[PDB]
Amino acid sequence: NEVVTREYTINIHKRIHGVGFKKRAPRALKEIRKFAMKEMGTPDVRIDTRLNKAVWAKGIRNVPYRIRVRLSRKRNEDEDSPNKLYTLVTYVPVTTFKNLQTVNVDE
Amino acid sequence: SMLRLQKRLASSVLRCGKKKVWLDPNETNEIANANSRQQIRKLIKDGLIIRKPVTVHSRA
Amino acid sequence: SHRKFSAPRHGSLGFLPRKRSSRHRGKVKSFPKDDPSKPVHLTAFLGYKAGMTHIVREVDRPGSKVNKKEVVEAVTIVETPPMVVVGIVGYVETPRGLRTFKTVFAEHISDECKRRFYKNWHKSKKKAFTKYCKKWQDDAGKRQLDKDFSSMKKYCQVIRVLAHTQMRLLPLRQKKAHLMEIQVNGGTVAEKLDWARERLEQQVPVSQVFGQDEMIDVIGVTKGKGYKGVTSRWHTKKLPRKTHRGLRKVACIGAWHPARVAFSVARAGQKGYHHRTEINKKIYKIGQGYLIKDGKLIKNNASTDYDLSDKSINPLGGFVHYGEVTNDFVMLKGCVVGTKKRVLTLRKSLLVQTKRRALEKIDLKFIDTTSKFGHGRFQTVEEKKAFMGPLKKD
RNA sequence: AGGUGCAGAUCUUGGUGGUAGUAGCAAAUAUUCAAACGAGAACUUUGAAGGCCGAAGUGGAGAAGGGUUCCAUGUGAACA
RNA sequence: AUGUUGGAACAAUGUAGGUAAGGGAAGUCGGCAAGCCGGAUCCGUAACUUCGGGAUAAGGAUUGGCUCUAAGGGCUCAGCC
RNA sequence: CCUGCUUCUGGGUCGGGGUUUCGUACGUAGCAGAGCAGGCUGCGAUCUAUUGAAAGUCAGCCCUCGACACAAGGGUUUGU
Fold first, then answer.
1. Among C77, C80, C234, C274, which is 20 to 30 Å from C249 by CA?
2. Which of C333, C338, C315 lies closest to C325 in space, CA to CA?
3. Which keywords does the record carry (chain A)?
């Protein structure tokens, strides 16, 4: 119902086309936070450090065009905030992006 | 907390810069109350603060 | 003193108010005048720019160096789906100008036309014309409708018709149709009114309005270019490199005792998105849309008398930034105003066309349907298959 | 009896306006994620990633000069 | 930690960098600015001269990678470094 | 300024083809390779076949109705 974990692949290349070199990677993390609020609409978006390493793996100029993401919504724990749900974003290492749909994985 | 004193102390004891000084991010509360080089040396033996290895400059 | 060497001024002052157009749809500022001898017909139509391509044709102009030779001409593709007539309007004529008399709409209006009467279709309850459509199923309503029609028989001098385009057949993102008054030119007022009454809620194809090898007028809005300087908007001379405060400017603007800066001097401002009216455009071909008979569709829109190939005018990969042309279309010689997906107003000529250029018939020999998404080199998909052969993915 | 009456002297002292929430906070490639703390985090601390100074350095110590700026704790009243 | 702040846009004018079909200074007081050449190896090098220079004058050819060959040495004729 | 925001339909994301740009990917095999050192084996720039291959392809290109969720929303005003 509300705890839903699902696979996603994001075309980073089409969301970065236009910005300058010294801001491509800092922008590149923004449409991952923006993507996370689109399907599972939780403002509290936490992205795993391994995802940050994968985007920054080629530096600040070259960014991978496609990337595979496990995008999972979980219950917000104590230190209570009005966003009772939050979304955890996890990098998924996949060798090829040919014929990848959005897989609704299970627990 | 704030740990510029422990990193400075860990630089002098290990005879290297703070670039190679690694503090444990999970035992921050234990490191924070050292305040002396004698208790800094104990944290070396306990493995909480470890010298980072030298970056490779391979000649091959 | 006087100017040392005379030179004509930069930019015409007839298009002086270079502001953003208050309208997005092209407007007929002057409809063609009518004479009672001609039968009733339409005088304007509304189309959408798709793209441009080549053409091959024979020239039959006497006395030229290019007589009986094959040429190429830049031709525009304007996809022109048929309209739906939704209403009529009458105009009484006053000493203060031309005044509208009465507007009479249809009984039921298609929801494509209902998009225009709303700024927000999602939040609205779509309640437009709900009580107006109740006038057609009561006996007092029909007598009032006939009394309104009989009133326009007496007093109205100029009669236009309200027709809208059909967004359902177009591949555009928007679904909001564009209403337009089109003046009906023809016989006297009475038969003019009866013809438009019959044409209510009826399909109006392009072939009723225009024909081949006919001068028409194109009305539309210029491609937007934003805020621009005098060098781009007015095409002034660039100052030398040694200038301190910049070189893409106008150096001397005005004189002293002309204590105000004049209206005729080139200043920076909005460039593009200007309403324009281009005249003397030649229709090489009025095409036919996709239609299905005996199971399979007919798409030989690019077929000529010598090509006889069943390819369509849609290039390989479709038109760039427009989509695919599936409805009937008009092929106009030369480039037209406006960008892709721009609404274009087609209008008959205001001048008597008796020239060698305007009366020359056109026989198409070859239509270039190669890909415009780069340097294309193949007309049809199956021609490329016969040249490339099998691939790895087969 | 006088150090006795101000609209000015690019008058003196002091205070306040329009400009104006405007010019501006653009010399030297670049920051990102997670955790800790806190009422409050872009700028504090830690870990990781990507970079720069590239030994004539943005490194390690001096002289002149500065004089408690050096160190620990605490504060976010004034300055940064 | 980017030099006393950040975020979103990418309009003109700017400041700093570049590229331009054909012409090649016709621009301009004036080749101003910009642009050409550039290191090394082998050729070759004028007028003039105070014989020292001009001179890297000018003007030509070559330059990558890989696989080989030859030559240039020390320690007791061959071996080993 | 110009659009869309449920007729089980709409768009969005991903994917698939179409188009196009560049030019034949990694790996493998070869008795192709100036040759070199111990029945053949080890090094070898480069070449051949796999391979018009590999890679990119709307962010402002074109068709999908393939897969996936989302969509009858939130707030402020307007009366003869």
1. C274
2. C315
3. Acetylation, Cytoplasm, Phosphoprotein, Ribonucleoprotein, Ribosomal protein
